Design a protein around this ligand. Structure first.
Ligand SMILES: Nc1nc2c(ncn2[C@@H]2O[C@H](COP(=O)(O)OP(=O)(O)OP(=O)(O)O)[C@@H](O)[C@H]2O)c(=O)[nH]1
Ligand SMILES: [Mg+2]
Ligand SMILES: [Mg+2]
Ligand code: NA
Length: 365
């Protein structure tokens, strides 16, 4: 005979967010007017974020979306327990890549600051031959220029400045669009957790948006040869096969789930930082939790871990937060590299079970 932590899914957690959090961050909190999507709907053990769609039409439409959003943002800014990092709505069509011709990309590059002009140039050279791969990493670089992203300050003010001294108006933007994305952060457990709320204030079908989001994730993973994330499209393809689905879900969410969570948590650090919602206490707690859970990655070694602990001795809060941010970017790629190496064997195991004619839509050779 013989005898805190990272956020884990419990039904208790879900009941809390639905009854205590959702009534504060949704426009129409009625359970029949919102749908939980993504990994939280699948109740994955290592909670990453929570993705929700609020279908508010017709009670909220283009007629009153502006007033409703202004009211929502004002309520959030008054709540010390809920953070609204960004509000995404609208596009800057000056940064739309349609043809991919040399002058189109030239005109776009001119609008950028010098440091972004260089990075733009590097992508052009590196992928001189692969047109599609060139255009993808170009869109990756000009992403935040093309897709308008608003701080609460920008929303309440009513406008914000874009590149080349062009101003954009918020009311004008939302009244000529159909959806708004709200990126929240809420205390869930021992650190802030992201909640993405999509407001759908037209009666439009979001199906082409989901299909497009799925295709984007496929390209992102494949073009970077991130074999772990390259498993995600396979989860779609085998959703009818019970045995393969269970194994893929286990590999992604259970076997390597903590790798994904740590990557999200590091990203959340960066997002909270650049959005201006990161104080030294919050940043320190996150780094502590990350250092703790890094030790739970079997066989993971990193020189960054020492550098991070070394910085913590400093007294200046701004220096620590900035240095941590730089170091965590490196740690992110180390975690990314580690999980992609471990997952390579599983990707090829299951892509080989895909009929040759269907490999093109699940894999970029
Ligand atoms: N580097 C990298 N990260 C990825 C890729 N695909 C997904 N991720 C990360 O995985 C996270 C999403 O994982 P989950 O939230 O568990 O899955 P999900 O809810 O279906 O995905 P979202 O709709 O993005 O929240 C994102 O926040 C990304 O940080 C990829 O191709 N490359
Ligand atoms: Mg998610
Ligand atoms: Mg999300
Ligand atoms: Na707030």
């Amino acid at each position: 005979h013989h005898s805190p932590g990272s956020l884990i899914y419990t039904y208790k957690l879900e009941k809390y967010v639905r009854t205590k959090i959702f009534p504060k961050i949704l426009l129409i909190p009625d359970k029949n007017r919102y749908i939980i999507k993504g990994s939280f709907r699948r109740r994955v053990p290592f909670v990453t974020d929570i993705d929700v769609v609020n279908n508010v039409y017709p009670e909220i439409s283009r007629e009153n979306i502006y007033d409703e959003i202004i009211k929502l943002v004002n309520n959030i800014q008054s709540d010390p327990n809920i953070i609204l990092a960004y509000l995404s709505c609208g596009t800057d069509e000056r940064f739309k890549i349609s043809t991919g011709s040399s002058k189109e990309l030239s005109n776009i590059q001119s609008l950028l600051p010098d440091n972004e002009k260089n990075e733009f140039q590097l992508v052009l050279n590196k992928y001189y031959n692969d047109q599609q791969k060139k255009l993808f990493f170009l869109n990756e670089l000009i992403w935040d220029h093309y897709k308008l992203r608003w701080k609460p300050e920008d929303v309440l003010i009513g406008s914000m400045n874009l590149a080349n001294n062009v101003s954009v108006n918020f009311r004008e933007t939302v009244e000529n669009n159909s959806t708004i994305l709200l990126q929240y952060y809420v205390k869930l457990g021992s650190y802030p957790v992201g909640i993405d709320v999509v407001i759908n204030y037209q009666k439009i079908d979001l199906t082409p948006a989901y299909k497009n989001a799925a295709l984007y994730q496929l390209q992102l993973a494949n073009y970077s040869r991130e074999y772990y994330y390259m498993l995600f499209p396979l989860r779609y393809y085998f959703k009818n096969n019970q045995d393969i689905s269970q194994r893929l879900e286990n590999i992604i969410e259970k076997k390597y789930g903590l790798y994904k969570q740590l990557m999200v948590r590091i990203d959340d650090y960066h997002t909270l930082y650049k959005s201006g919602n990161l104080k030294i206490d919050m940043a320190t707690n996150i780094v502590i939790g990350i250092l703790r859970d890094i030790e739970k990655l079997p066989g993971f070694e990193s020189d960054t871990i020492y550098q991070i602990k070394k910085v913590a001795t400093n007294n200046s809060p701004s220096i620590k937060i900035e240095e941590w941010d730089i170091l965590l970017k490196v740690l992110y790629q180390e975690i990314n590299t580690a999980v992609n190496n471990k997952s390579r064997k599983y990707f090829y195991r299951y892509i080989a079970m895909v009929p040759p004619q269907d490999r093109s839509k699940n894999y970029i050779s």
